[PDB]
Every structure is written in C-alpha cells, then in structure tokens.
Write a protein that binds this ligand. Structure first.
Ligand SMILES: *[C@@H]1O[C@H](CO)[C@@H](O[C@@H]2O[C@H](CO)[C@@H](O[C@H]3O[C@H](CO)[C@@H](O)[C@H](O)[C@@H]3O)[C@H](O)[C@H]2NC(C)=O)[C@H](O)[C@H]1NC(C)=O
Ligand SMILES: *[C@@H]1O[C@H](CO)[C@@H](O[C@@H]2O[C@H](CO)[C@@H](O)[C@H](O)[C@H]2NC(C)=O)[C@H](O)[C@H]1NC(C)=O
Ligand SMILES: *[C@@H]1O[C@H](CO)[C@@H](O)[C@H](O)[C@H]1NC(C)=O
Length: 411
C-alpha cells in the first residue's frame, strides 16, 4: 500500500490505546487543518508572549504538530490524552484518536508528493532512540507510511556526542545545509528518546522584485529607535485588505499559487504585540476571505530568520507533561529490555527563512521591465517599515506551514 492510496483501515486501531473527545460557507477546510491552525495560534501566542518585541520569531507549527502526531502513535492513557488535548486534535468533532493519523496521511500525501513544481517542501521529523530500543513492529509500519519517518537507533549511552553530530548531519543534509545545528552543543548517556523535526521550503515569487529597486530605507523597531534595512520594492495585483484597527493583510503567492506568504502589517499607531494577542484561527480565516485582488505598491524588506529551540519546556507549560516524565510517560509503542520507563528526553525544532527579490531562499537575479503601465495616483501602498507578522500557508489545504514575526530585518 501507498501513502496516497492508504485507506482508513490501513491505520490499525488497537482498543488498549484509544481516546474519545466529547462533542461540542465557501469551500471545504479539513478538520485536521483547523485543529492544526488552532495549535499554531495557541502555541505562537505563547512563544511570542515570552519574547521581547524586538526579537524575530520563526517556527513551523505544522512540523511540530506532525512530529507529535507521529509520537502519539505509541502513546497511551494520560500520555495519549494530553497529546490530543494540547495539539487540539480533540477539537475534531467527535472522531477517535486513530483517525487523526488517517488525516495526516491524507494531508502529508498532498504536501509532499514528488510531482515536482517550483516550490519545494521537504519534511524532517524523525525520532532518535538508543540502540537498546526496539520500536514496536506495527508502530513502525504506520510511523513510516503516514509520516515517512524512521525510528533511527543510535548510541547515546556509549559515545553520545558522536550521535548528536549524526543527527545534525542528517537534518543539515535534508535542509540543504541551511539548518546544521538542530541539537545544540544537550545529549548524553541520560538520553533515551529524541524527537527532531523541521520543514524546509524554497520557492520563487510568482511576482519577483527587481534588485534594481532595493534601496536602504528605514525600519522602526519597537523600542522606538530605528535602523537600516534592505527594502525591496514593486507594484502589481495582489490579494489585499486593510482590516480592523487599520491592519494591512497581504498575500504574496509563490510560483504555483498553492503556497503563499501572508504578511500582517498593523498601522503605525498599533503595536504588533496587540495584534499577536488577538490572533485566532477564526480571525485569521476571516481576513484571508476578505483579501481582494488589487493594484498596489509593495515595500517589504529583505530578511533572514533562523529561529530554533527545545520544545519540552514550553510544551509542558502548555499541558504536555507525562510524555516527558520518566515515571508518568506511557509509550507502549517503544520497548527496551528491562526498561519499562520510556519517556522523551527532549524535542528540538529549527526553522529557517531567507527572503529576497527572488523568493524563498532562491537567489538568482531577475531584472524587470514594465512597458506602458499607469496606476491610479490614488493607490494603496504597503510599506512594511515597522514590525510585522509572517505566514507561509498551503492554500489548497488551508494549512499554516510557517509563522513568525520579522521585528528586526536590520543588518
Ligand atoms: C491504560 O489504559 C488501558 C486501556 O485504556 C487500561 O487497560 C484496561 O485494563 C483493565 C484492567 O487491567 C481492563 O479491564 C478488565 O481487564 C480484563 C479483561 O481482559 C479483566 O479480566 C479485568 O477484570 C478488568 O475488569 C480494561 O478492559 C483495559 N482497557 C480498557 C478497555 O479500559 C490500562 O490498565 C491503563 N493503565 C495504564 C496506565 O497503562
Ligand atoms: C543525504 O546524504 C545522502 C548521501 O550521504 C544523499 O543521498 C544521495 O543524494 C544524491 C544527490 O545528492 C542522489 O542522487 C542519490 O539518489 C541519494 N542517494 C540516496 C541514499 O537516496 C542525500 O541526497 C542527502 N540528503 C537528501 C537530499 O536526502
Ligand atoms: C505492537 O504493540 C501493540 C501494543 O502497543 C500490539 O497491539 C501490536 O500487536 C504490536 N505489533 C506487533 C505485531 O509487533
């Protein structure tokens, strides 16, 4: 059987570890994407909340949700329940926890098909365990089929540091060397399980900027003072909409039109922080529906953002506790001889974004010529010269792939 042809019954459901969540316009939006977008917002609001307004933030919530959905496969009892609760999977109307995997199956088949296009989307979620660990036979099948992940054994007990390098080597190798340190220089003999996940993305703007127009304008940091940023410039039709409290929403599609960058730029008078605190799937979904094609002037800066962290802490502060507890963790999916206390040592994540005139960490140079164009002098301008939010969504799937805050694109 194939990941894109796997029917629902191919995702075995054992009674010993099943959860049951109590009950509670336009095209069709998958239930799973909604559940993911809820975690994305929820999680982001936290991360931001604990970060200074002048810091850049960037992560892939889809990646995190995927790594743990793949992990909850071997979970059970309170471990399994908590995972469902934190990762909003239980908001899914009233289906069983095993069906969630059938969804990710259908979602991952769409996001990572080989049918090449201009924008490439590579996933890297793997679970690293010590050699002595034997991932259950059936747990393996699914983890691989549905999440294309392995349960790669390593030696943390004897010669840990050599395996930590093995890890960073793999990720680096899957992110085309753009992420070479997912595991900070955090591993030892007292390390049983390690979950690593990231998403690599590269794309070309469906509507490129001309480096010929990139001058150094001024970016106004949240602390009041300013600094210099490489400001890209262009004019054209874009899905746009100035929403509540004067906040501009801008969709910049990558070639292909199925993956787009959605920028949220609040008015000078409003603090990005006040908008981050108002984000919710419902509110985001509403803005995206109001976006209307339109000619306008775009002023977005060139920026590079490489954010990376250890999820364990924040996740626990969010309700994910057992999974990380040597005594509470219930992982019937993983097994070791004479070791009945399998827990997750940690979970690491790292996202990277390079944005210039070409697109997502693309770097060719494209010049542009426009003959005989005249725009209504009274045209809208989107000058992102103050902190703004960023989203990399997968439109046909209404899935939030990446999200961050460019609070300082200054050299
Ligand atoms: C974790 O969750 C498991 C299921 O959710 C749970 O297993 C449950 O265990 C009890 C008793 O051990 C079972 O109830 C009956 O089990 C046998 C039937 O083979 C009877 O002989 C006993 O008298 C008992 O009444 C449940 O059927 C079984 N699962 C269900 C359906 O609830 C584990 O005990 C839980 N504990 C942990 C932390 O792993
Ligand atoms: C990870 O490293 C391996 C080599 O150690 C790469 O595998 C080969 O990559 C070349 C292109 O660089 C392909 O032509 C081969 O088909 C690959 N062989 C295998 C094992 O399938 C691999 O590309 C690196 N990372 C990636 C992109 O997966
Ligand atoms: C894997 O373990 C589960 C319980 O965790 C069990 O139901 C299943 O039969 C095992 N898979 C195999 C065939 O090894």
């Amino acid at each position: 059987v194939d990941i894109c042809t796997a029917k629902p019954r191919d995702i075995p459901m054992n009674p010993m570890c099943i959860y049951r969540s109590p009950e509670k316009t336009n095209r069709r939006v998958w239930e799973l994407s909604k559940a993911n977008s809820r975690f994305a917002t929820t999680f982001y609001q936290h991360l931001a909340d604990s970060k200074n307004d002048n810091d850049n933030i960037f992560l892939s919530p889809l990646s995190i949700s995927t790594a743990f959905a793949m992990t909850k496969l071997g979970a059970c009892n309170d471990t399994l329940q908590q995972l469902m609760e934190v990762f909003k999977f239980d908001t899914i109307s009233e289906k069983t926890s095993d069906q969630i995997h059938f969804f990710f199956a259908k979602l991952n088949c769409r996001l990572y098909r080989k049918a090449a296009k201009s924008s490439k989307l590579v996933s890297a979620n793997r679970l690293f365990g010590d050699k002595s660990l034997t991932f259950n036979e059936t747990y393996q099948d699914i983890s691989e089929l549905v999440y294309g992940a392995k349960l790669q054994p390593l030696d943390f007990k004897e010669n840990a540091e050599q395996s930590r390098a093995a890890i960073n080597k793999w990720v680096s190798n899957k992110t085309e060397g753009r992420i070479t340190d997912v595991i900070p220089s955090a591993i030892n003999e007292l390390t049983v399980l390690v979950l690593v996940n990231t998403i690599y993305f590269k794309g070309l703007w469906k509507s490129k900027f001309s480096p010929e127009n990139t001058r150094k304008e001024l970016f106004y940091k949240a602390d009041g003072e300013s600094c210099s940023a490489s400001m890209m410039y262009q004019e054209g039709k874009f899905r746009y909409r100035r929403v509540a409290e004067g906040t501009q929403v801008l969709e910049l599609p990558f070639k292909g039109d199925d993956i787009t960058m959605v920028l949220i730029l609040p008015k000078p008078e409003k603090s990005l922080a006040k908008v981050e605190k108002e984000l919710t799937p419902e509110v985001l979904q509403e803005w995206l529906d109001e976006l209307e094609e339109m000619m306008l002037v775009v002023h977005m800066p060139r920026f590079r953002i490489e954010d990376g962290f250890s999820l364990k802490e924040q996740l626990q502060d969010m309700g994910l506790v057992d999974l990380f507890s040597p005594e509470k963790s219930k992982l019937p999916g993983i097994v070791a001889e004479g070791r009945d206390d399998l827990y997750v040592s940690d979970a690491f994540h790292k996202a990277f974004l390079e944005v210039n005139e070409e697109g997502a960490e693309a770097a060719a140079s494209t010049a542009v010529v426009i003959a005989g164009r005249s725009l209504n002098p009274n045209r809208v301008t989107f000058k992102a010269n103050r902190p703004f939010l960023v989203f990399i969504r997968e439109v046909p799937l209404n899935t939030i792939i990446f999200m961050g805050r460019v609070a300082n694109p200054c050299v």
